[PDB]
Amino acid sequence: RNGRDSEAKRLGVKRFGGESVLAGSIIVRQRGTKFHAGANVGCGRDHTLFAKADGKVKFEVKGPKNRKFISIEAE
Amino acid sequence: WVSKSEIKRDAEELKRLGAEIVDLGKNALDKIPLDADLRAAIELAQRIKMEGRRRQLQLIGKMLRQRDVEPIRQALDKLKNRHNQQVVLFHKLENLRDRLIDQGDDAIAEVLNLWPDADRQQLRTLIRNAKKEKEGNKPPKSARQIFQYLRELAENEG
RNA sequence: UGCCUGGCGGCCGUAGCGCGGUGGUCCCACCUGACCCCAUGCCGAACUCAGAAGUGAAACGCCGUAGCGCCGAUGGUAGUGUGGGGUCUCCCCAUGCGAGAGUAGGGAACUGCCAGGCAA
RNA sequence: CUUUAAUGUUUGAUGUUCUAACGUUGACCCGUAAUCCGGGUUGCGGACAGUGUCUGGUGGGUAGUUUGACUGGGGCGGUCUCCUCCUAAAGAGUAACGGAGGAGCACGAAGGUUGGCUAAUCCUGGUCGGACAUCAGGAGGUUAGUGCAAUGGCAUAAGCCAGCUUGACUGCGAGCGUGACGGCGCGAGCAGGUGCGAAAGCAGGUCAUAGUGAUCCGGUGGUUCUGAAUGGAAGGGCCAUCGCUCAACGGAUAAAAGGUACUCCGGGGAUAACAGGCUGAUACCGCCCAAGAGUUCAUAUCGACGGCGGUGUUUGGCACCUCGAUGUCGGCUCAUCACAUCCUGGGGCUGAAGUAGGUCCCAAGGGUAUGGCUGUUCGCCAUUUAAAGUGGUACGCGAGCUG
RNA sequence: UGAACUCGCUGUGAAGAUGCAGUGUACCCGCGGCAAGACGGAAAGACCCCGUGAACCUUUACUAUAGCUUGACACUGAACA
RNA sequence: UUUUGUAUAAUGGGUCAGCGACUUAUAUUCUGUAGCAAGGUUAACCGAAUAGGGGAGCCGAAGGGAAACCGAGUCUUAACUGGGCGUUAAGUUGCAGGGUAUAGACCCGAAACCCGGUGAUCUAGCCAUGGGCAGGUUGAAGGUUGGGUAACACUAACUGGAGGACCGAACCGACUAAUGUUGAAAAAUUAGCGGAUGACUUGUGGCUGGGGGUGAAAGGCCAAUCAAACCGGGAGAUAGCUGGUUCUCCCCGAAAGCUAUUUAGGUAGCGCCUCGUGAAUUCAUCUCCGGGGGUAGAGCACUGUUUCGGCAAGGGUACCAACCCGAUGCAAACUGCGAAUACCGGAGAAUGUUAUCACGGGAGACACACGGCGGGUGCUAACGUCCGUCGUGAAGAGGGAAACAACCCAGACCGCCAGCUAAGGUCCCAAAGUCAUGGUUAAGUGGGAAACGAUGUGGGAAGGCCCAGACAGCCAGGAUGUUGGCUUAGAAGCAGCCAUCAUUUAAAGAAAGCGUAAUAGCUCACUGGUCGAGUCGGCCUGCGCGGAAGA
């Protein structure tokens, strides 16, 4: 009776460090907020991070709680 | 816990009721206590045809899911009871006529028991005429007269 | 140039807690009244207005204290990719990488900018 | 004109009487040596009956069809869409009739903005009140809460309270994610007009995933877009929206339940039943530590609590050969071989005085029945002996015969 | 009847070997008998399943109808209460 | 041929000779070829005609939108910093070829439906007309005779003549057994059985003609065939199903995977296969750099689970127990920690026939099995089933393993009487060391198998006593109360409550075995003398034996 199957949400990280991205590109697909947007990174309603400008995605740890932050630099 | 099989069966029953009320005539619709919106939807379903009619019937059933159905079921039950009584009377008349044509004296006795006022002489004459018509491939005038006489006797009894 | 003070950031538990001492020259805080601005599902509690009379108790800044919390090697160990062996539902050999915990040790902070008091 | 009254017109529902239509397989006469048929007279019923079209109902008697898919033979039992966790092997994705559970809502606010605020568990004091109501203080740092089952996240609070509004608006949307595709989601940014806020700025719904259904067709509002000669209208085309547990949920019809041993056709050991093979839970047998029984004394004889070993003699699973044919249980003739030996033969121990016995080793050279019970293999009973042994050979033998 | 110079045992082998590996035996060719096997020959299995295959049958499965049957319209009229 | 898979004992074949399988027409897409070229091109038809006329007609060069309409612009909106579709490549007519759809379109093999006719000499029933059914059996009504009653009834006799009656020929039925199943016959023959004056049979003639006829009513028979006869047509019906598809050579050469499907053996889309065109050190290997995990491992901060000890709400205080505290564990559904592989992007030396990507034409396939790696399931059994990756076979021959595709080494262009080598072997069959060095084994272990057991063998840590001479042996001793109080029935040491004393002492205990009702008696604890050197209890074990019996 149990074990009913449901299509996966295809979450994960789409863009990794060292890869240039364009404005509006989706960086990471997450259900909650595992990573927090920083400079040049915007967060949508579905807790999805996107790039507002061209650059290379970067990841840093900041804040009192040491939460992981995703930021983009124009390089 | 509600079984989805039971839910599907209930939906099928609701759709059957919707189709039956749609098929019903104008007088039946007037008699049945239907709301204005449901009446308009039923009229639209009757006007339309093809898959549109079936999907409008599906809408009718979906609305009936929430709307009460007991008055509608009662009205349909009484109308069907009247129709079935009429059909059963017609079937009894037809079977009695067939038995009169086939057997003879036994059917005459049955007719007399059902209606004491029935004329044995007239029934015998009509049966003999029907047998002669059957033998001579003549029109079933005797059979029609027997049917009319039985209908008159039934009306008098009722 | 520094003993100090308040704010703006990086780093964020070597960065936070337990104990004692240390400060009113400026700043900070406490404090007085709120008639008026301000608001309490009631209150100057919270916030705000005019003062600083009075003080450094609480908090706040500094120092010592290792008692915690925390970081933390080296080596070893578990594990594991590659090609093999065996008493092959498990283990071992050559090679590469390499844990967690614990130990020695560190540790009770560092740093850039602005503005004010002291002596220079 | 609403309302009434005498004559005169149209007639309809209804009753009676009549016959000229209509039937006479009633009688008489002729064509006619004629039970057919036609023609002339009469009687019988007579606008009845029936006939042709339509219509209401009945109508497996007849004609055309359906009765989906997964399933540890098949039926029954359970499921057909979406969401959360593990299996799912540290990108994504990944099956099972695997294990745990939910959804087909709801909110004119529970949405946007501005401002402010921060719970569980316990201790202390206090009228009902008591461990657990509410009040004050103490540690706390998310264990609270975040409408719905679950997951992650939420201190800037995505949590709670208060002032205003509907940005839950219209026309687009670069650039991406996700699937083979239809399709679905994110998305900075441009034009118009708005809500909050003095403002930087936020608002294109709900902290975030399920709450949904393509296409055809129809319903409502707008559009001279077209409207088959002209001027219109009807009908069409487009924009906005509504209509399906089409739950068989990527949905073949608007419309469909079962048997065939009277069946057939083309195939499948892709797929079963008897036999073969693998495997060995179960079944039989042997043994180990050993509590204990055995008049004391464990192993003369049994021997629980546990485990270890051989076989396929019953019950188990795959169907790997076989459905272009392997004839599947018993009886007879023919029998073959192993010893886990019934007796005969040689031996050990004995709770073995002797005959008669209890247990174990070697030895298969040899023998190893008849009747009743069932079809029976097998097993029970009665009678004799030395016994009337256990097993493998398609549970031997239907290319031997009767079922 | 694919062709045969067509022995037995152990194991394997699409899983029951005349034909594989090892082993043992056996002169060649005829005739009268037994029948273990060449999963002997016979029927593109009647048994189980597949087919949106067929045919018959059942109906309160679907769609129509013969037949039955209600009424209207013409044959079908005349007198009046 | 089937399949993951064949000599397999799954399929077909006896062979020879002949015949036999992707053709043809209409329209569409692409390739090669010929021309013209912003033009190409003719159909029908005329035509002393494969010529020449015929520009009727069709296709692209200008597209967008549904259309109006607009125009190298168009569609959306009052319109965009906007977005989709057009421009910067040239189309057309024939030939041949690769597909597409229509026509039976690769072929053979079905059941089954309708239409138009033929049959009742076979067979079933009915009608009309004739014959046959030996022979022998008891006899119901009626009549007659004697007795009998007032008269009947009744009785004993003659005549009398009906049996789906009895025995029994011919004849009829096949009810049973056998003969045979290409037969003697496409259902007949032999031996019994049943009837043998009745719903009997038979010669002859006619009718009942196929969603129908007939059936003393089993789906039986209807010209050897019947749950729907035969003959011709629709029709070469359809068939997701069986089977076959015939000459050669070279190059490349996969899969049984994902989504979908009234879908599971059928088929649509993507990856995978192939040829062509256009494209970037495009991609792969390896080094370095930046990455997020939550698997192994470890742990229990949290979620469940588990044992112990304590405070213990609550509950009925010797009594059960919540919320918790300290320790030990476990978890694919827990992570305060956490890797190696796996994957993304960047930089780089070198190799790889661009091994990388886009498009077009055609495919094939959508049954996979095994081992290794971490598993679900199953019994951590199955040559059992399902997952992510490599390989094998399918699609790969060879050598080793006795034979075995998944076990090991190894990728066949062809030939040569050449050498080397991988795995595996060197006593031989059968090619090579009866090689060398130091050991283990005394069992055919090698050359199937475990819990357990054991003076088998070599060694190690060792451990106790040992020429003030150890162990076991060789002629010697074990004398006396201790016949005990005690349960005195006798235990006296040889069953127990009990001390576990004491003299001779080179030496003896108030006691270990054998048996007597207890006695008694014989050994052993220790002690005189000679020889005398070494002696004894376990652990680790590699190699050995039993447990190990099947036709």
From Swiss-Prot, chain A:
Q: Which domain of life is it from?
A: Bacteria
The UniProt record lists the keyword Ribonucleoprotein:
yes
Q: Which UniProt keywords apply?
A: Ribonucleoprotein, Ribosomal protein, RNA-binding, rRNA-binding, tRNA-binding
Q: Name one GO molecular function term.
A: rRNA binding
What Pfam families would the database entry show?
Answer: Ribosomal_L27 (PF01016)
InterPro entries membership: Ribosomal_bL27 (IPR001684), Ribosomal_bL27_CS (IPR018261)
**Could you give one GO CC term from the UniProt record?**
cytoplasm
Q: Which GO terms describe its biological process?
A: assembly of large subunit precursor of preribosome; cytoplasmic translation; cytosolic ribosome assembly; positive regulation of ribosome biogenesis; regulation of cell growth; ribosomal large subunit assembly
| UniProt cross-references to NCBIfam families, sorted A to Z | L27
Family the entry assigns: Belongs to the bacterial ribosomal protein bL27 family.
Per UniProt, subunit arrangement is: Part of the 50S ribosomal subunit. Cross-links to the 23S rRNA. Cross-links to the A and P site tRNAs.
HAMAP family for this protein: Ribosomal_bL27 (MF_00539)
Identification of the protein by name: Large ribosomal subunit protein bL27
Origin organism of this chain? Escherichia coli (strain K12)
Swiss-Prot record, chain B:
List the gene name.
darP
Q: Which GO terms describe its biological process?
A: assembly of large subunit precursor of preribosome
Oligomeric state and interaction partners are given as: Interacts with RluD in late stage pre-50S ribosomal subunits. Interacts with ribosomal protein uL16 (rlpP), via the N-terminal loop of this protein.
Say which species the protein is native to: Escherichia coli (strain K12)
Annotated domain remarks: Has several regions, N-terminal loop (residues 1-25), a central domain (residues 26-105), joined by linker (residues 105-116) to the C-terminal domain (residues 117-183). The C-terminal domain is not required for function, while the N-terminal loop is; shortening the linker decreases assembly.
Identify the NCBIfam families for this entry. Answer: PRK05255.1-1
Q: Which cysteines are joined by disulfide bonds?
A: none
- Which SUPFAM superfamilies does UniProt cross-reference here? PSPTO4464-like
Function as written in the Swiss-Prot or TrEMBL entry: Member of a network of 50S ribosomal subunit biogenesis factors (ObgE, RluD, RsfS and DarP) which assembles along the 30S-50S interface, preventing incorrect 23S rRNA structures from forming. Promotes peptidyl transferase center (PTC) maturation. Binds pre-50S ribosomal subunits near the 23S rRNA L1 stalk, where it may mediate correct positioning of the L1 stalk.
**Localized where?**
Cytoplasm
Region feature Not required for functional ribosome assembly, mapped onto this chain = 86-158
Write the protein's name. Dual-action ribosomal maturation protein DarP
Question: Can you tell me which family this protein belongs to?
Answer: Belongs to the DarP family.
The effect of disrupting this gene, in the record's words, is: Slow growth at 16 degrees Celsius, accumulates a pre-50S ribosomal assembly particle, although some mature 50S subunits are formed. Ribosomal proteins uL16, bL33, bL35 and bL36 are missing while 23S rRNA helices H38, the L1 stalk and H89 (part of the peptidyl transferase center) are incorrectly positioned.
Sorted alphabetically, which keywords does the UniProt record give?
Answer: Cytoplasm, Ribosome biogenesis, RNA-binding, rRNA-binding
Q: Which domain of life is it from?
A: Bacteria
Q: Name one GO cellular component term.
A: cytosol
Identify a single GO molecular function assigned to this protein: rRNA binding
